[PDB]
């Protein structure tokens, strides 16, 4: 069965403005699509076992990735900050299926995750619909 993750982005801090610069879809489970409906980022996936990554950039230089997926039928998420110039969204997304620390994050099947970058800015994902096939998450930028 298809899994869908609908993402709403909340920017709370006027000291920066982030915008999406990359949207990737991993190749497992017949892939999927990132679309937009009413300013929400919708990731539609062919079944359980894949994910997609949104990369955001602020004009002040800050950036991060937010990755959303389903692993053994349960949602997961992760945020990577302090990105190198050669860590594009497609690099990060693939690492969830090759790099140990990323694979472990996926395997945790988190309904919520937060992390701060080197400047102390908080980034959080919270699934407000956290079970079943029609999943909804807030991405909250501090
Ligand atoms: C500050 C930062 O980006 N830390 C992350 C963490 O958020 C993420 O869970 C991880 C595994 O993918 O790699 C990095 O340790």
Probe target for ligand 1 pocket from 56, 69, 79, 110, with the most ligand atoms within 8 Å of CB: 79
| Under 8 Å between Cβ of 29 and 43 | no
Nearest to 51 by CA among 64, 37, 66: 66
| Under 8 Å between Cβ of 58 and 20 | no
- Print the SS3 string covering the chain: CCEEEEEEEEECCCCCCEEEEEEEECCCCCCEEEEEECCEEEEEECCCCCEEEEEEEECCCCEEEEEEEEECCEEEEEEEECCCCCCCHHHHHHHCCCCHHHHHHHHCCCCEEEEECCCCCEEEEEEEECCCCEEEEEEEEC
What is the rounded distance in angstroms from the CA atom of residue 142 to the CA atom of residue 130? 22
**Sole residue written with tokens 């945790």:** 108
Residue 135, token pair as written in the block: 């999943």
What is the rounded distance in angstroms from the CA atom of residue 86 to the CA atom of residue 6? 28
Cβ(80) to ligand 1 under 6 A? Answer: yes
What is the rounded distance in angstroms from the CA atom of residue 86 to the CA atom of residue 124? 23
What is the rounded distance in angstroms from the CA atom of residue 96 to the CA atom of residue 105? 8
- Closest ligand 1 atom, CA of 115? 7
Q: How far is the CA of 35 from the centre of ligand 1 (A)?
A: 26
Q: Looking at domain 1-142, which CATH architecture does it have? A: Sandwich (2.60)
Q: How far is the CA of 108 from the centre of ligand 1 (A)?
A: 13
What is the phi-psi region of residue 60: left when phi exceeds 0, alpha when psi lies from -120 to 50, beta otherwise? Answer: alpha
Cβ(7) to ligand 1 under 6 A? Answer: no
| Residues 122, 124, 127: CA angle, nearest 5 degrees | 170
Residue 47, token pair as written in the block: 């079944």
What is the rounded distance in angstroms from the CA atom of residue 2 to the CA atom of residue 136? 14
Q: How far is the CA of 49 from the centre of ligand 1 (A)?
A: 20
**Cβ neighbours of residue 100 under 8 Å, at least 6 residues apart?**
none
Q: How far is the CA of 92 from the centre of ligand 1 (A)?
A: 10
Resolution, in Å, please? 1.7
Please indicate the experimental technique that yielded this structure.
X-ray
Q: How far is the CA of 39 from the centre of ligand 1 (A)?
A: 27
**Cβ neighbours of residue 80 under 8 Å, at least 6 residues apart?**
64, 65, 67, 87, 92, 102
Cβ(82) to ligand 1 under 6 A? Answer: yes
What is the rounded distance in angstroms from the CA atom of residue 82 to the CA atom of residue 90? 16
- Alpha carbon 94 to its chain centroid, in Å, reads 13
**Sole residue written with tokens 């982005």:** 9
């Amino acid at each position: 069965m298809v899994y869908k993750i609908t993402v709403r982005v909340y920017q709370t801090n006027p000291d920066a403005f982030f915008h999406p610069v990359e949207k990737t879809v991993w190749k497992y489970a017949n892939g999927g699509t990132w679309s937009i409906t009413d300013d929400q980022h919708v990731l539609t996936m062919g079944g359980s076992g894949t994910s997609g990554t949104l990369r955001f950039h602020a004009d002040n230089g800050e950036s991060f990735t937010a990755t959303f997926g389903v692993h053994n039928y349960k949602r997961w998420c992760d945020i990577v900050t302090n990105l190198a110039a050669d860590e594009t969204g497609m690099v990060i997304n693939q690492q969830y299926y090759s790099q140990k620390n990323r694979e472990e994050a996926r395997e945790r099947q988190l309904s919520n995750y937060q992390v701060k970058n080197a400047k102390g800015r908080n980034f959080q994902i919270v699934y407000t619909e956290a079970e079943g096939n029609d999943l909804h998450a807030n991405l909250i930028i501090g």
